[PDB]
A paper describes a structure:
The final model of [name] (gi:54040095 Swissprot: P67273;) refined to 2.0Å resolution consists of two subunits in the asymmetric unit. The two [name] monomers in the asymmetric unit tightly associate to form a dimer along the sides of the two NIF3 domains opposite to where the PII-domain is located. The PII-like domain juts out of the dimer on the side opposite the dimer interface and forms homotrimers by interacting with the PII-like domains of symmetry related molecules along the three-fold axes. In [name], the two entries to the central hollow space are capped by the two PII domain trimers. We observe clear electron density for two tightly bound metal ions at the junction of the two NIF3 domains in each [name] monomer close to the protein surface that face inside the hexameric toroid. We have therefore modelled two zinc atoms at the putative active site. Both metal atoms are tethered to the protein through several histidine and aspartate residues. Residue Glu329 is coordinated to both metal ions, while a water molecule, or more likely a hydroxide ion, also bridges the two metal ions. Additionally, we observe a clear electron density for a ligand of unknown identity in close proximity to the two bound zinc atoms that would provide two additional metal ligands, one to each of the two metal ions to complete the octahedral metal center configuration. The contours of the difference electron density map after final refinement suggests the presence of a head group directly ligated to the metal ions and a mostly aliphatic tail that has few specific polar interactions with the surrounding protein residues.
Residue numbers in the entry:
A (entry chain B), D (entry chain B), F (entry chain B): 1 to 161, 166 to 177, 195 to 370
B (entry chain A), C (entry chain A), E (entry chain A): 3 to 139, 201 to 370
Amino acid sequence: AMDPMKIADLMTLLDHHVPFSTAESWDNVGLLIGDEDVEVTGVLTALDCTLEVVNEAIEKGYNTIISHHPLIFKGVTSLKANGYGLIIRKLIQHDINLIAMHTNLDVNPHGVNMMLAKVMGLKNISIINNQQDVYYKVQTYIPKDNVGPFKDKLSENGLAQEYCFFESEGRGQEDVDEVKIEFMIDAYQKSRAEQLIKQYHPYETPVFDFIEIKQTSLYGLGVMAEVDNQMTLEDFAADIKSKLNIPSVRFVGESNQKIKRIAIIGGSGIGYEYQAVQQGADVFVTGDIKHHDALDAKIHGVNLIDINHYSEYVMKEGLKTLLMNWFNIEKINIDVEASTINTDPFQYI
Amino acid sequence: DPMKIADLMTLLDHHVPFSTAESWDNVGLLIGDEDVEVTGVLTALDCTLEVVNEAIEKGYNTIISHHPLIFKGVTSLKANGYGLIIRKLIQHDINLIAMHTNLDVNPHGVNMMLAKVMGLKNISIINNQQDVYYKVQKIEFMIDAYQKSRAEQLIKQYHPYETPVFDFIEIKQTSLYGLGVMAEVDNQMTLEDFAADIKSKLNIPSVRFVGESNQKIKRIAIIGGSGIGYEYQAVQQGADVFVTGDIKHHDALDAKIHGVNLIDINHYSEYVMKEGLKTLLMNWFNIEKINIDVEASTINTDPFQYI
Amino acid sequence: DPMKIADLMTLLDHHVPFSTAESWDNVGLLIGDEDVEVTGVLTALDCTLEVVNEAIEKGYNTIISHHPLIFKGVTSLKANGYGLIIRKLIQHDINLIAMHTNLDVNPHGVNMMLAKVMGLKNISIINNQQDVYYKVQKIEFMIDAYQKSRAEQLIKQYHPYETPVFDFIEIKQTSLYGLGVMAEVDNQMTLEDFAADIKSKLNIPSVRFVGESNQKIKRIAIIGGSGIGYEYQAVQQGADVFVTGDIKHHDALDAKIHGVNLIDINHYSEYVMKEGLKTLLMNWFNIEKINIDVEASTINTDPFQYI
Amino acid sequence: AMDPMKIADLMTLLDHHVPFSTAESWDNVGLLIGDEDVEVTGVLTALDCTLEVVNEAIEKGYNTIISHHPLIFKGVTSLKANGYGLIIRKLIQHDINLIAMHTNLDVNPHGVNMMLAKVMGLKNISIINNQQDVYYKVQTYIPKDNVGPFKDKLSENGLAQEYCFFESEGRGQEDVDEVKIEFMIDAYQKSRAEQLIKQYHPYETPVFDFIEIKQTSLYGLGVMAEVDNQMTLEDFAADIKSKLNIPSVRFVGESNQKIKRIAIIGGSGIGYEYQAVQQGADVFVTGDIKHHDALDAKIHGVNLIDINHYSEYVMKEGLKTLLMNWFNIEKINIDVEASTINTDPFQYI
Amino acid sequence: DPMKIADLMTLLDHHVPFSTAESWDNVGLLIGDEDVEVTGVLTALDCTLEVVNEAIEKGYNTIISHHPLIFKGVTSLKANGYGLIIRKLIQHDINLIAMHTNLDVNPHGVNMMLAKVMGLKNISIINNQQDVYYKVQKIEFMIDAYQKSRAEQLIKQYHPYETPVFDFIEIKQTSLYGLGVMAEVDNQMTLEDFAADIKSKLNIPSVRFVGESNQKIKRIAIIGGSGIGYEYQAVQQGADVFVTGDIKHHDALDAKIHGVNLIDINHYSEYVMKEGLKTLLMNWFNIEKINIDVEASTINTDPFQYI
Amino acid sequence: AMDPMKIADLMTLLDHHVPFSTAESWDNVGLLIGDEDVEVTGVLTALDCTLEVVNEAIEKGYNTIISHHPLIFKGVTSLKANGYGLIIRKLIQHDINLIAMHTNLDVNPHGVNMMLAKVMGLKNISIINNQQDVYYKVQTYIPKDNVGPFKDKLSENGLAQEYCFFESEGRGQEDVDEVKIEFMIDAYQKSRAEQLIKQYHPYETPVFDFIEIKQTSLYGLGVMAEVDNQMTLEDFAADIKSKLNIPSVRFVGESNQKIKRIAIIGGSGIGYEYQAVQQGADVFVTGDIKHHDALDAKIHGVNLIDINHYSEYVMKEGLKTLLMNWFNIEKINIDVEASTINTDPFQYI
Ligand SMILES: [Zn+2]
Ligand SMILES: [Zn+2]
Ligand SMILES: [Zn+2]
Ligand SMILES: [Zn+2]
Ligand SMILES: [Zn+2]
Ligand SMILES: [Zn+2]
Ligand SMILES: [Zn+2]
Ligand SMILES: [Zn+2]
Ligand SMILES: [Zn+2]
Ligand SMILES: [Zn+2]
Ligand SMILES: [Zn+2]
Ligand SMILES: [Zn+2]
């Protein structure tokens, strides 16, 4: 009997590749509207889950929408037949499930900013503004003959996974010859490590320490990348306008300024431009740039390009490609399509 | 007609104005479509999953609860918890209206209803809101604060003066609306006898009181739900005892040490508004010649079981 | 005379009272010496280094900008960034005056100016401030709220009464001042045609709108600069479209989903106040027989270049 | 000449067994009203120090009351002959001393929740919600021949207490063969360790490090325990109503729900119920449960019992027993009695 | 009678209303029993242990201090620090009353007392509070804001109208109460000569002033204690110099650079209220024919010794 | 061609000896008014940069003022010809540069409080209230034959500066014999250490850890010192009144109290007096003491002397001496003078 993919199965897969925990703590991510128990009939990717996107899912026979922007952000205080209420009610009434992969996708090594850089034809792309992840170096002290079965039992129970220990010789008190064994755990394992250590240790009152270690994460908001060939600011702006099919672009800085290194935060990344320049950027590319921030940037020589917040729409095809690949790996046959609807609230003239 | 949700909302607003609710509250049409024709109305304290099933079973597409099912914003709508209730409403085209603190402060609302279920006399609203009006000024006449704009559009439109002369003088008056009632028994009774009396009249499994059992009670202040914070002011207003729910140890100990008598009839005693609201709505419907069924939900939705 | 900075400040205050500015704003003489004789006045949106160089070159020692060059307090004055501009003003004895939110809310200010550059009709201030006056009371007569003290020093000084009897009755009236204007086109036009029309009239490189291109527009609300926050209220006030700058994605998406039409003419479109303010000041100077040159800065100070 | 116990001596003993530092930082604990210098004539334990409790101390000739709840919590702005003022004035006027052992006793391994679990007849009782205590692993580097007198001097001065060091061999710079010696200190000792190390080290400029270590405390708010035999929620509720002589109990959950593991926070512990369930509880037992929190718990399947906040009264006899034992150990002859007054503000009908 | 603490409190409230104290303050009966008969009253700035010993020694069971011995809530009452004082009061049945900011803003309070000790003329309260009254409205007459309730209970009780028509019109008037006095010397004097004059009249060990020593002084503003924050407003009100205590370096430097003259007479100079309050209370007692001894504490409680 | 000292050069020197980073985060320090590019013609030290001080710089031909107090503290919202505006405009109009060495000088081992103690003739002067500086112990694991060129490359690139490593032998997994090498970095180096380690390590995926270490700083607010000979509080007060030429001093405490150890925070240090007593002070010396704080101190037995905030004026001559010395070391010929103007806003009578 089959194991068709349920929303719960899809969530586990999504979380494996683009962990929901990497989203900012103010964000609203994951299954926003739906039922974990329901079988997935098809997946439509979207930037914003507008009414037209919901109609498109219905029309295609897909019961799952993955959007970048969370349709419910600050809690809803009503669900009436108007505004965002009309969209949420339509999802529910048609048994459509909506998952938001928001700032977790903004900070993912294969996420919105990698996608933007790739669509711009850039090279040497890497994550910037890296998160810090908390780990612990576990240190226990144990007699040499006790070292093996202590290690095997900790390893049998999934610690140091495999069997990754570092062994140090020393003398406790030199009353007692001991082996100081070390290994790494993620922050959530501390309590279980304690349990296992106390349980399988030789000493009645065993001696063990957790030393907090911070490591630079692979996750971070933005990428730094480079153009193949150093070019002028205005030429770079024109090139990316064309590549992303943007109706209008605006830039801040001398039009003939030479550009090689590019920092990109899709959406609304103003606030990071000065740090981007400190990180080596010649220009900071983002959306939703306002007058006074552009004015400040100009006077300080910080070069900007506004590609519009709407340029995050690249994640529809990008996430479709990712998900198709993840599904291939797992041998899952479910269709994924990028929504073709242009959902930009702005029309340019 | 037939009566739509939009028309029901207008009527309810007329009798229990939604603007008398507290600013933090969430009242009105919480879940639904104002264009839908009302098939029947079920009244509820809390809109539980069982209450939604009762509406469906009775053929009613409208529920009016006291407590707002959505209070702080909901950040997801999953098939779990409160999500299940909200999703069931939507999937069955059931409209949910919340008449919350507007009903707590209404002259015919929760506290009137409590006082009447208790058999009390000389019941009056306490803790009255303050309404703002303007005495428009040499002629003079009144206006609601909201008419100030239109009145001026009117005033400045026609007058002999190149610049007509007029004044809006802010006047404040005691509202008919407020949180709680003061009321009285027919004859003085002991605090313990009064507590038992109301236990029995409200069908409460357990009541608790603060104060000597032989304290004599004539004047009673009532705030249904969770009214702790108002007990000192009630005594100030003449109360021999403050009646509310959800009384906690330290608040009761403070009251005891200050000589303030309390009775905890439980928050759940607000359930009286089910039948109370059904009666009101039947009467309002009768005035407007609306032939729509109203029933009080019969489900006991108290999360507590007493032993 | 000759007119000093102190005299100019008095005049500007008379016509565009600095007290109508928002409490968070920074307006008035920001950089300078009130005793210095004005040689000429250059009007500006933003006081950039290029604008200071233009003043110097024209022989003008006074600049009036809309945007305050010093807004939050500056914690240093170095030869870098905004420091360079501030230091250049000081070292060339150039006086800088900021007519900021006081000009945004004036009946002849930024939004009147925008509406006129757009060719609009029936232009009126919206979002009006409220002025406080006192009806002094049996005689009765008016006073500005600021006269309450002096009036009383006067009132209590001479009266038959050992204790004269008098009342100050607070009266509130709609101000002539407020943020934004409502106005109308001569004949209904599509939203896209209106957007293009104003693009052309204001010489804007790029405009963007929210709403169906064939929406019909007659009534228009305008808040120059960054007026998002006021669009729902404008529709409430009758607007078919809200015109402002600095519109961001999520605010535009919200408006679109609620049926609220917008046009982003860019914050930089406040530049119309350069010529607008020059015309006002020339007229005021003419009334007072002041022979001082006023010119609108010709420098395009938009930090954005469009492609 | 005698050393009769003074309030100061009693405070030291109380603090040894139920450290005042384990109280929450918002709490008001310790000697609230009295004189450290005064000789203790007898001790009366209480939940709340009401006027009747003060009269009872006077009547018995006891000059010391230890309550759980602090009679002064937020500061008093007056001391008049009414309300709480009347109680505080009576203490002072009769030279009665009042000590509050409040949240320090809530979190103690022998405190309010252990007492509650014991009175309920539960087994396998352990502290939950454990505090974290900050320690340091001190690391110094020292030549082998210098190791002994360095160690002895640090130990003579009460560090590593005894003589608990761990010894590591290594090469500094291999210009210099060194011994890396390690030991533990509590957080308050850092400065003294620094002093002693600098003082007795071989090197003119000695090399030493303090590495912060967090350890799970023995102190925590609540206990987890189990019934001898799995029973129904309603049967468990009835049993504990009887054992604690409670006039009325209420529960939330299906009456026939099977219960084995019980989390208990006496007083007002709502806020911890969801975490208790994550920790393995079948039911969360507490007091002062309000409607909307009970409603939430019901819909989420979290089972609750309200035993009333007043059920903290078990600490009168419990603390009497503890104190009698502590006094026996120290050979102190001072009487301790649990106040017999029922001080519950509520009467049930 | 004999006069109880409750009666004393009523009298003091009549002459120096406790409601004129700041909302953050702690005034009234701080420590004591309102039912106890007053044996005698000692006045104090700070109620130190030495002042309590003085009361005990004189046979007085009532102390009135300016500064509240309990200000923020006390979290313990031990035989140490302030605990020792509070416990000594209680154990000797001594009643402590604090007349704090109510005395600072009274027309016969701390600042009147300072100005009189200085020999000044034309002394008037400054920084006046605002009292709210209602003109009840065709008859019309006044009421204190507190009478609004009773008046309405009365008003609505008897009238021809089924619904009587009445208005409460909020009127605001300048209070007699406020923080500080303005006053003047008989003849202009230098700032240094004035500072020395007041040093001598108040027996101050050390005074310090801000401003040129030859500045001419006629009009003086005084806020006893720690009145920094009010010096710019005092100059606005006509003061040549602002006199207060507890002046710090940066506040003095700011004043100096702005041309605002100051004198620091020390916070401790509020001690004048001991004799000042004794005289007031003797007079009030004389009016009511109360034969109770009042004495000003003779203890110098300044924590500072000057060298 | 010459390298005359520019403001930028002076700032680097100032920062070397009295690091601007040791200032409190609310403070406003460094070049407040001026141009980094401008050549320094002379330096005038000041407590407060009043108009007279600016006139004095002009008159002397000096274009640089270093003050203790920042003339711009909370941002200026205008620069008009009055008040502080007149002073700032005069600086600018005369091309005078103004640097503030504020709380960095309050906390410096040779700063305001060392200067005060020295002028008082005190002995055994040391910094109190020490800052804590964050460092990292870097730990990498590497095979023995790889140890040399790994070390040399890290050292070639300026880590462990020189060549300060500690070497530990151990077994990774005993599959692999490894050397655990350790060294110290300042907190700002973490990212570069990561770069260098990844770059020059043997392992494709090298194993390395940063362990946060806090060390007691040499910087702190205040000093503790002692009088040569134990003396009475009143005698000490009189002595320091004379030594600092103060017009009036006031003290709190019994006039015959014996004083040996003195804590000093020049300026306005009330808030630290209780901690000073805990640190061993017999008296806390500061300025701007107010009534109620003095009253509190008296009742608690905390002895105080108010030497006035203006007594920070000792830093004019003190900083002149320091700067002359720093300039001598660098062979810089620029004149430094302490402003002679008494800028105390107070006149005493
Ligand atoms: Zn994004
Ligand atoms: Zn976005
Ligand atoms: Zn209610
Ligand atoms: Zn309720
Ligand atoms: Zn504007
Ligand atoms: Zn603007
Ligand atoms: Zn407790
Ligand atoms: Zn408790
Ligand atoms: Zn005062
Ligand atoms: Zn005072
Ligand atoms: Zn300083
Ligand atoms: Zn200072």
